[PDB]
Design an enzyme around this catalytic site. Structure first.
Site, short mmCIF file in Angstrom:
data_model
loop_
_atom_site.label_atom_id
_atom_site.label_comp_id
_atom_site.label_asym_id
_atom_site.label_seq_id
_atom_site.Cartn_x
_atom_site.Cartn_y
_atom_site.Cartn_z
CG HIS A 288 39.38 43.16 37.83
ND1 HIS A 288 38.74 43.39 36.64
CD2 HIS A 288 38.42 42.86 38.74
CE1 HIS A 288 37.44 43.21 36.81
NE2 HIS A 288 37.22 42.91 38.07
CG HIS B 1 43.88 43.38 33.91
ND1 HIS B 1 43.22 42.90 32.80
CD2 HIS B 1 42.94 43.98 34.67
CE1 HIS B 1 41.94 43.21 32.88
NE2 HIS B 1 41.75 43.88 34.00
CG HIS C 54 40.67 39.39 35.54
ND1 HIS C 54 39.46 39.11 36.14
CD2 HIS C 54 40.46 40.48 34.77
CE1 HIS C 54 38.56 39.98 35.73
NE2 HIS C 54 39.14 40.82 34.90
CG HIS D 169 36.04 36.80 37.22
ND1 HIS D 169 36.98 37.76 37.50
CD2 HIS D 169 34.84 37.35 37.50
CE1 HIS D 169 36.37 38.85 37.95
NE2 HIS D 169 35.07 38.63 37.94
CG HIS E 261 40.86 35.18 37.61
ND1 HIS E 261 40.00 35.89 36.81
CD2 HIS E 261 40.90 33.92 37.10
CE1 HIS E 261 39.53 35.10 35.86
NE2 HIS E 261 40.06 33.90 36.02
CG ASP F 182 39.05 37.65 40.03
OD1 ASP F 182 39.27 38.32 39.00
OD2 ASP F 182 38.73 36.45 39.97
CG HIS G 43 37.00 46.83 34.57
ND1 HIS G 43 36.94 46.41 33.25
CD2 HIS G 43 38.13 46.29 35.08
CE1 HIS G 43 37.97 45.62 32.99
NE2 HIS G 43 38.71 45.55 34.08
NE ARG H 120 41.20 45.38 29.93
CZ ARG H 120 42.09 44.42 29.71
NH1 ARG H 120 43.39 44.71 29.67
NH2 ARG H 120 41.69 43.16 29.53
ZN ZN Z 1 39.02 37.61 37.41
ZN ZN Z 2 39.73 43.90 34.46
#
Ligand code: ZN
Ligand code: ZN
Ligand code: ZN
Ligand code: ZN
Lengths: 153, 153
Positions: free
Chosen positions: A46, A48, A63, A71, A80, A83, A120, A143
């Site tokens: 992702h 962020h 995100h 999401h 998002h 995403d 992740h 993370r």
């Molecule tokens: Zn997301």
């Molecule tokens: Zn994330």
């Protein structure tokens, strides 16, 4: 034809370089690179919101989500902006990322330059997990590595 | 107010955190933070063109120079957008940074988000050194620590 690049680093063994290329401002972003040190299988991937690494990956905020949506996966209309779904690490722990996305951008209000790319611990459930966390973070766990997305030559 | 942050890091002991704030899109950027691990005295302090850390600090490129000027200090009319002159490290090797600048910006064409903040081995000679390199880099020697400038909360 803007370009960007991100060096992924964390407290653990996950290390990588991710490239971004967007040939035209109204166009798809190609995302590619190699990430090593990952456990075999799926990992949430992702953008962020904040390019802020002062308190490690935890200061990168949620995100990247300028449209205040829920999401989802990268194919979903409800997602998002940040995403990007999952990347797959092979048996040697290497994920050879190759993604093309039309929602992130390297300019305008979906710009991800100066924000934080995060890989992740587990799989992103793409919002299909049936709990409140699923529609927030996709339940991808911790993370493992991150870096600020920078303008590239 | 647009805000940005940079975590400066390198191979050795020099490290730090620099914050940026710009209340008005057409107003000055305030720059403040702290860098430690430095030899006492003056250290060049530049925004370099690329937020590319793939080959450490060296891939950061030249000073950010969108108007194609010659190198100078921050008070000069003839300067790179990235020329923020020097920070000063005390006897304990800590540079307390507190700058205001009207040429860099956190948005638009002079935008430094996603570029590389660098702190240097020696003094920036502000372009008054008398050799070719003075008109390019200021002769500030090595890149001791760097970071990509990221959007902050
Ligand atoms: Zn997301
Ligand atoms: Zn994330
Ligand atoms: Zn420099
Ligand atoms: Zn310069």
């Amino acid at each position: 034809a803007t370009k960007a690049v991100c060096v992924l680093k964390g407290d653990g063994p996950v290390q990588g370089i991710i490239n971004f290329e967007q040939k035209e401002s109204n166009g798809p972003v190609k995302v590619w690179g190699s990430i090593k040190g990952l456990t075999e299988g799926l990992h949430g991937f992702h953008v962020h919101e904040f390019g802020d690494n002062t308190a490690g990956s935890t200061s990168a905020g949620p995100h990247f989500n300028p449209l205040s949506r829920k999401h989802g996966g990268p194919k979903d209309e409800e997602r998002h902006v940040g995403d990007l779904g999952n990347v797959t690490a092979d048996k040697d722990g290497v994920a050879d990322v190759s993604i093309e996305d039309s929602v992130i951008s390297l300019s305008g209000d979906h710009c991800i330059i100066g924000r934080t790319l995060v890989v992740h611990e587990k799989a992103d459930d793409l919002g299909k997990g049936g709990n409140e966390e699923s529609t927030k973070t996709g339940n991808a766990g911790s993370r493992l590595a991150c870096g600020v997305i920078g303008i590239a030559q």
